[model samples]
Target: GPHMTQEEAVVNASLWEYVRLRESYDADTAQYAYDLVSNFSAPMVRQNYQQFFNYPNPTSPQVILGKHGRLEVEHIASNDVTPGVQQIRYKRTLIVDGKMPMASTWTATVRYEKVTSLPGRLRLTNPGGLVVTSYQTSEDTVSN
Candidate 1:
């Protein structure tokens, strides 16, 4: 047995709350975006991951429109082959052009680790010390 239940729970919970910031764009709520990627201590990976939260973000138009996004974590697993890598499946629904809501499922390969101490920062964003070193997502399917 993996005996990884608690760790799995923490990852799952964090994914649920953390990933909503991806498709759900806004200044007030989307501020949590930084909370998701900040602790990635690896300089190269941290910049790559942080690229998703650029200040003049491409997704900001949705913020101005008062539109919203819905995200559900369909699944999360850490297999024997890659324990540090998380296999995450999620569904995101968001509107396009102010007319219809589009939904799709995506699989995310997330590489993460935890640290004993995080330097020069408070624990409010990531108290558990989750350091995500890499993130990549691709769609399994899309629907109109």
Candidate 2:
């Protein structure tokens, strides 16, 4: 069983919100969301998501939101391994790229810690730092 507190709930919600915007084609909204939740502790996470903003081409964004684009956390498990630090395991669903409707299930690990910069707030210190251990998806087929 996983014991969850208000802090955990907020962290999960923030993760989902951040991913939704990060995977979006709308550049400004995506950038805003990234800036809103990103902390200095996770420079790599910020850098990874930043690539989606402008890559392959300077005038076009790489991320394309699908028709039913959404982020859903299927399950989450959290444990406080040390004081002010917690480890989170989560199963997430990502649906994107409308034409292809690429949907995938990602199993991820994250580290959450209480930040002095934001009093009474918890921040993701190791969000998707290549911590996505596994990915599963349905068969791919062409469709018009």
Candidate 3:
């Protein structure tokens, strides 16, 4: 069961990394930032982000205002409900422009699979070959 057990570790790390990259972004780095984040997600999830995040415009407004979101993410738990599917729980704290830190709990439901594209297309960054087919985040109320 060593191989089975290790899969969880790798998945956990990928979830952490995906969330980290998704959160930490700036207007200047939007191009490369989208590329890096897309590496971890499948087409279904990737397509939503490009237009959703609104890359340059939304990100640029904050940049011009000198307001940067310093986001901190903490891994709380990982549960593999089924093979290639995981439910991750974490906390995100952001201190944007030096105001009081705003903290919230979040749950990311992710789908992992070997999705393929053009024959020659390859993800050198994703050596693990884990692609998130579905992505959704629910911000949980911080009862504690």
Question: What are the Cα lDDT values of the candidates?
Answer: 0.57, 0.43, 0.69
- Which pairs clash in model 2? none
Off by over 4 Å in 1: 1-4, 55-81, 119-121, 141-144
- State the lDDT of candidate 3 residue by residue for 1-144, as single tens digits: 435667566667777777766755455655666777786677779987655665365644244333356556788888888888788788878667758887888888888885554223444555556888888889985455
| Model 3 quality (TM-score) | 0.74
Clashing pairs in 3: none
For candidate 1, write residues 26-73 as lDDT tens digits. Answer: 445544555554554357666754564554556443334443443334
**Cα TM-score of candidate 2:** 0.44
Tens digits of per-residue lDDT for model 2 on 57-107?
453343343233544444344455544344445444544545543343333
Give lDDT: candidate 1, residue 90.
67
Clashing pairs in 1: none
Between 1 and 2, whose lDDT is larger?
Answer: 1
- Which has the higher TM-score value, candidate number 2 or candidate number 3? 3
